[PDB]
Write a protein that binds this ligand. Structure first.
Ligand code: AMP
Ligand code: PCX
Ligand code: MG
Ligand code: MG
Length: 491
């Protein structure tokens, strides 16, 4: 049900993560010139499948956090028949055949570090959905799924430095960093890049392809026998995912979050009734929502005020979940390739914003698994599935904004599976349906923070939280959001 590991801290030559779970140190056969690592994973899963060893080429050790979705495909290009036992061994098999190019073939939600001889490889999935950070110095390489574990040396080109940190870099999305341990030299190869050209397709085929892709992406994300949990908002995106997940599992559990300001329970109810899902509504006080601020920056390790604002309600929801650890699917990210913020018929502006968004998502960590695993829950997002993403991004603007409706192709793709009311439902940003942006603004406004200046205040606040939780090793619970807002408002 859950991946073999959520993250890790490794070194090639006392880990503390936001992620909740068991810790397991891997054995160090060649004790020495070996790959040491601490894996963080669910208490209910065996780390084994997240670790693979080999002698092909050299002594080799692979560690992988997360999971791969196009397994059948990758397996079809391998020689022998005895299939690898897990995703880490699968990667290993692929590396022995394509070398670092193996990552150009992977469609997944993972982060991995591999040591073969004195060579070290650091790879992320196409979207860098599972953040990966590193510190490289001649003779020593440290990699971790959380920068906070690395804050406790040389500069690396074609990698960005982490805010308020030194010698700590984030491996870019869709990339593989090839590091020679001896010289400490690092070379980065991109293994995926957003398509820039657009595809033309008749309505019927376009709508069918989108439906088929999403169904497949969702199917790849639901575990056989296990009923998944979908964070439902009543919007077309999460609703589209719910319909697909329900079909792949034959049943479905849903959940919706709301505040005392706002909610989308009504819109969500329409869908829970259409598919007859096991639904649950959660209402967290606005004051409780804002108190989540330090937890969001700590888990996401992001400094973008706008993203942190989008993550607040999600973070609160994951932490407020009751019951056993769940496999959660979301409809997050659908608006990006579809320009879900575009509100007119003039297509030009839609593509401009789309191209810009697709070129600047890396580093935001908005889809990081830590957002949910901080409470022991694993999340995956089918709309940013490589295949679904490639397709949605490639469609010509006229298929996204058509018939006076935004994200048209997606709405039409779920038409025969959801109520008409849900299909035509205008877009709403979870920030609007629960009043997160307004609440955060009101908080600053109630502290004296003037208007043409709340945004910058939100920046200073978020950045201050980061320096404390990520750079200073301070746990969110030990941080009082009000005190930080106070300090920032004084300016
Ligand atoms: N009020 C909510 N309760 C539960 N899940 C939500 C809620 N609002 C949004 N989500 C989830 O998070 C994603 C946010 O995307 P968006 O609505 O485009 O901002 C949706 O695709 C849902 O899966
Ligand atoms: N430029 C970006 N990377 N924007 C991300 C906004 C997320 C968007 C989504 O679901 O794609 N989203 C959150 C509410 C909403 O809309
Ligand atoms: Mg959406
Ligand atoms: Mg919404």
């Amino acid at each position: 049900v859950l991946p073999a590991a959520f993250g890790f801290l490794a070194s090639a030559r006392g880990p503390v993560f936001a992620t909740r779970g068991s810790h397991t140190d891997i054995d160090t056969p060649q004790g020495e010139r070996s790959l040491a690592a601490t894996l963080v994973h669910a208490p209910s899963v065996a780390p084994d499948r997240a670790v693979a060893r080999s002698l092909t080429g050299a002594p080799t050790t692979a560690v992988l956090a997360g999971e791969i979705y196009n397994r059948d495909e990758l397996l079809s290009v391998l020689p022998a028949g005895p299939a690898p036992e897990g995703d880490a061994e699968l990667v290993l098999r692929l590396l022995e055949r394509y070398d670092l190019h193996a990552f150009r073939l992977v469609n997944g939600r993972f982060a991995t570090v591999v040591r073969t001889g004195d060579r070290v490889l650091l790879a992320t999935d196409h979207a860098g959905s599972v953040p990966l950070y590193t510190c490289v110095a001649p003779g020593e390489v440290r990699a971790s799924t959380e920068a906070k574990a690395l804050a406790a040396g040389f500069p690396l080109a074609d990698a960005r430095r982490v805010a308020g940190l030194t010698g700590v870099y984030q491996v870019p999305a869709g990339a593989v960093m090839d590091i020679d341990l001896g010289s400490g030299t690092a070379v980065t190869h991109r293994t995926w890049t957003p398509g820039l050209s657009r595809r033309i397709l008749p309505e019927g085929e376009a709508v069918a392809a989108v439906r088929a892709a999403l169904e497949k992406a969702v199917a790849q994300r639901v575990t056989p026998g296990d009923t998944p949990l979908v964070v439902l908002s009543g919007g077309i995106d999460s609703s589209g995912v719910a319909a697909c997940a329900h079909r792949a599992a034959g049943e479905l559990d849903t959940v919706s979050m709301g505040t005392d300001t706002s909610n989308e329970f009504r819109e969500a109810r329409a869908v829970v009734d259409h598919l007859r899902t096991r639904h649950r509504e959660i209402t967290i006080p606005t004051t409780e929502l804002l108190a989540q601020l330090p937890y969001a920056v700590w888990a996401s390790e992001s400094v973008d005020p706008d993203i942190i604002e989008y993550l607040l309600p999600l973070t609160a929801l994951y932490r407020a979940l009751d019951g056993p650890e769940r496999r959660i699917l979301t409809g997050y990210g659908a608006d990006i390739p579809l320009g879900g913020m575009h509100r007119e018929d003039r297509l030009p502006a839609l593509d401009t914003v789309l191209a810009h968004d697709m070129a600047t998502f890396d580093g935001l960590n908005e889809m990081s698994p830590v957002l949910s695993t901080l409470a022991g829950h694993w999340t995956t997002h089918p709309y940013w599935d490589r295949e679904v993403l490639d397709l949605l991004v490639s469609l010509e603007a006229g298929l996204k904004r058509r018939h006076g409706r935004d994200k048209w192709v997606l709405r039409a793709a779920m038409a025969d599976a959801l109520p008409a009311e849900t299909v035509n439902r205008p877009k709403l940003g979870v920030h609007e349906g629960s009043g997160t942006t307004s609440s955060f603004s009101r908080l600053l406004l109630d502290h004296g923070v003037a208007e043409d200046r709340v945004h910058e205040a939100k920046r200073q606040v978020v950045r201050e939280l980061f320096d404390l939780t990520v750079g200073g090793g301070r746990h969110p619970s030990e941080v009082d959001t009000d005190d930080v807002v106070r300090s920032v408002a004084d300016r």
